[PDB]
Ligand SMILES: OC[C@H]1O[C@@H](O)[C@H](O)[C@@H](O)[C@@H]1O
């Protein structure tokens with residue numbers, strides 16, 4: 001629910017299961033990126 | 043696994059799974075009671 | 085100096101009741117005008133105490149007291165909660181070494197009894 | 209007025225790398241003396257932004273900047289983090305509508321390349 005509660009949550013207990021758990025509840029949303037919206041330099 | 047981190051954790055996200063999750067990590071420990079250590083009055 | 089307890093609820097009663105009834109000692113039947121006091125000793129290794137409870141068809145009086153190792157303190161005042169609609173939970177820090185008293189108060193009930201599903205925990 | 213970011217780590221790298229490599233876009237290969245900047249837009253529905261990253265055999269330069277919708281703000285200074293030993297994570301609130309810049313800085317590397325495993329999240 002509360003975004004600051006989601007932040008303090010993941011800090012303490014973080015694991016792939018918790019990430020997958022939160023992923024399902026709709027609390028967190030995995031964002032896909034691509035070739036664009038990405039840039040390179042020397 | 044900080045005890046104060048377990049308290050605010052459960053409050054927000056509480057579920058049978060999370061209880062079972064914390065049960066496994068050794069953060070929370072289920073305590074069994076019996077006929078004694080229990081008392082009745084009228 | 086005593087820490088205020090945390091208290092909340094979760095809507096899933098049926099799932100809670102199911103996981104609990106698997107054990108008989110976790111299901112209390114409170115008679116008419118009766119008060120059951122569950123004594124949970126403070127674990128020295130422990131810091132926080134968690135509790136959960138629910139009833140089947142009816143509400144019940146619930147409060148919490150703390151006994152020193154005669155002296156006493158009120159953690160949760162004894163009030164009638166509707167735990168048949170929702171699972172009632174809570175938590176408290178350990179302000180010492182002593183014994184917790186979980187009060188299930190049916191005193192006001194003349195006729196109906198109460199099937200209580202309750203569970204505890206502790207920390208390190 | 210800008211919120212300080214939260215930053216932590218967790219020991220399970222092998223599990224992280226495996227779950228990530230299932231997707232090719234989640235795996236970046238940073239060349240010699242190269243800097244890859246990932247641009248993640250702010251979601252109006254969103255408040256908090258989370259990130260995770262790891263490398264295979266080597267460390268990598270990592271920092272975070274924030275762009276306004278040319279003005280800029282330094283969130284996480286660009287530093288060399290050892291992400292081959294542990295999975296590096298972090299979180300930050302949204303101080304507006306804008307675009308985040310995730311800096312993977314290989315600039316200091318003459319020879320070796322870097323296989324990066326990175327994942328992003330957001331909230332409501
Ligand atoms: O660019 C963003 C960063 O660099 C300069 O613009 C500012 O002085 C810094 O306070 C800021 O953190």
Ligand SMILES: OC[C@H]1O[C@@H](O)[C@H](O)[C@@H](O)[C@@H]1O
Nearest residue numbers: 266267268316317318319320
């Ligand atoms: O930073 C990761 C690696 O990048 C290479 O370019 C450096 O020469 C190495 O010493 C370093 O361990």
